[PDB]
Each structure stands twice: as C-alpha cells, then as structure tokens.
Paper text:
Senescence marker protein-30 ([name]) is a 34-kDa protein whose tissue levels in the liver, kidney, and lung decrease with aging. Biochemical studies suggested that [name] is a [name] ([name], EC 3.1.1.17) and requires a divalent metal ion such as Zn2+ and Mn2+ for its [name] activity. In the ascorbic acid biosynthesis pathway, the ring structure of d-glucuronate is cleaved to generate l-gulonate, and then a γ-lactone ring, which is a basic structural framework of ascorbic acid, is formed from l-gulonate by [name]/[name]. The crystal structure showed that human [name]/[name] adopts a six-bladed β-propeller fold, which is similar to those of squid diisopropyl-fluorophosphatase (DFPase), drug resistance protein 35 (Drp35), and paraoxonase (PON).
The hydroxyl groups OH(2), OH(3), and OH(4) faced one side of the inner surface of the substrate-binding cavity, as observed in the mouse [name]/[name]–1,5-AG complex, and formed hydrogen bonds with Arg101, Asn103, and Glu121. Polar amino acid residues (Arg101, Asn103, and Glu121) that form hydrogen bonds with hydroxyl groups of a bound molecule are located at one side of the inner surface of the substrate-binding cavity. On the opposite side of the inner surface, there are fewer polar amino-acid residues (Cys16, Ile202, and Tyr219).
Numbering used by the authors: 3 to 299
Amino acid sequence: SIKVECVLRENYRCGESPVWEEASQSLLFVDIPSKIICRWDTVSNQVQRVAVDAPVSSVALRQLGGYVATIGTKFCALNWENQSVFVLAMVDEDKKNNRFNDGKVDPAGRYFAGTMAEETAPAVLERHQGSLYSLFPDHSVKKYFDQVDISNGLDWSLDHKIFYYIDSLSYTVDAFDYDLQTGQISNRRIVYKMEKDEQIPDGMCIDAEGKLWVACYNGGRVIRLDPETGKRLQTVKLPVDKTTSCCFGGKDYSEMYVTCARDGLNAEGLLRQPDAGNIFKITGLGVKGIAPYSYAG
Ligand SMILES: OC[C@H]1O[C@@H](O)[C@H](O)[C@@H](O)[C@@H]1O
Ligand SMILES: OC[C@H]1O[C@@H](O)[C@H](O)[C@@H](O)[C@@H]1O
Ligand SMILES: OC[C@H]1O[C@@H](O)[C@H](O)[C@@H](O)[C@@H]1O
Ligand SMILES: [Ca+2]
C-alpha cells in the first residue's frame, strides 16, 4: 500500500530543500537556478513565489516570523508579506564562484548550511571548495570543516547527540558526535556506503524511529538506512531519475514529499520522464517523520 503520486506539476528546473509548514499546511522549497523560493498551499493548491537575485539553495522556517534562506553564499531573512529579503551573514567571500547548497535547522534553532563550487554540469566543478557552516541565533557564523565537494543532506539523531551529513561526491552518509548546547561536532565516521545503482546521495531526513531516508540523485529512488548497522532497510522508486531531496509532512508527518530536477536531461530524457521537475508525494511508508525546527534568530 505504498503509493507514489505526482502532486504538483510545475516543471521546476531543480526542486530542492522541501520543508513542511504545519501552521499553513504548506510545502516550502526552492527551485535553485530559477532563483525562486516557493510556498505551496496544499489546501487551496496555490503556489506563491519569491524571486531572489541569485541561486537559492535552501529555505527554513524562522521562529520569530517568516523564513530564512541561503541565496548565493549569503544567509538571508525573508518577510513574506513585504517580500523583503535581507542579509544576516555572508560566507566564502574568499571564493570567486561558490554558492550554498543544502541546509537545515538543528534542534537548538541553528541554521546549518554548506557550500560548493558552482557547477558547469551536474557533478562537474572545481573540487573541495565547499565548507559546512552554521548560523547561530546570534547571527554569528561557525565554520565546521572545509574540503567539501558538494555539501548536501543533513539531519540530527532523535537524542540530539549525533549529526548526520552528506557530501554528495563522497558517496557516503557520515556521522559526527554532536553537542546540542554548543552546536559543536566531532568524530566524523562513515555510517552508510552508497551502492553503485544508488548513484549520488543528495537530500536526507530522519524518521521517528531514527532511520535515515536519502534521495538518490540519478538513482530515481529514496532509500531507508539504519545508521547503527550501515544496512539499507528499504528502497522506493520514482518515475523520475533526478530525485533531489525528501521530507515528511502532512497529517502527523505521515506523508513524504520528494523533490526532483529536469536540468541535465537531454530531449530523450525529458520525454522518458514527463514529470521531471515536479513534486512527488509518497504515502503508506508505515513510519512518520518529525517536525522541522525553526531558526532561532
Ligand atoms: O513573514 C510571514 C510569515 O510568518 C510566518 O510565521 C507565518 O507562519 C507565515 O504564514 C507568514 O507568511
Ligand atoms: O580566509 C578568510 C575567509 O575564510 C572563509 O572560510 C570564510 O568563509 C570567508 O568569508 C573568509 O573571508
Ligand atoms: O550533487 C547532486 C546535486 O545536488 C543538488 O543538491 C545540487 O544543488 C546540484 O547542483 C547537484 O548536482
Ligand atoms: Ca541537494
């Protein structure tokens, strides 16, 4: 009784960073090269978009009101009403051609996000140019580690002592010891090795049983992993190859939303994947996810 359905047919170039906003029953996400932050009201079925002046790679809820996003190499704050967007902090001013990629807020309201050299084609870029950062409620920025190829999916264990992290071109899901009170991490190790047919690990979220779900870019699937054993538990395929990310949403976080891309597909690829770029929902997984945390600054 697992069902995969295409639920929003808007043909995004590279849908990414899905987050469920329970208060409005809306899905927030981005379409990266289209430079828009999107909010899809699942009830009225209307989509609203805020255009920004650079590629926008993630979006998160802002506790005091509105949203935050990573635009270019800048952490930004958004007031949805006035469509006002302003800079909270800048990173990689060091770099001629970087951008943020995936980001998510930690259980203490810190906005974690990492960067990458900009691509000329999917996974074609100058190597090791990224770093992982976090924006504290302070608006101060902590830099964690560099030498990242493409900073990607991330989440936190339910006990808040472990941080899970994907650098896409490492083809592994990694884990760190994590301290909730300070936001520090330590002891990086591999917890899952991607198989060849699982292609590039991209976005990731944890479920209520502590298992990890990873979107497989080019693999046309999400997989469920046990970070304690390093074994895959489950695979769910989708009719689009460039599955980018996933999050839980809907009633009690019982439904999974999956984003995907059409960028990089040739004419044949497009015809073979008519729903490339659209938003998918997966029902009947038999597990629930958890609420997103809101940024505390
Ligand atoms: O800045 C505006 C936003 O503030 C949030 O706290 C509300 O949940 C959104 O519906 C609103 O659009
Ligand atoms: O060396 C200085 C540079 O270090 C980088 O890691 C930071 O992101 C830059 O913003 C800073 O200017
Ligand atoms: O690494 C696979 C893909 O992951 C996405 O998060 C990035 O935005 C893309 O640029 C990248 O090609
Ligand atoms: Ca991604």
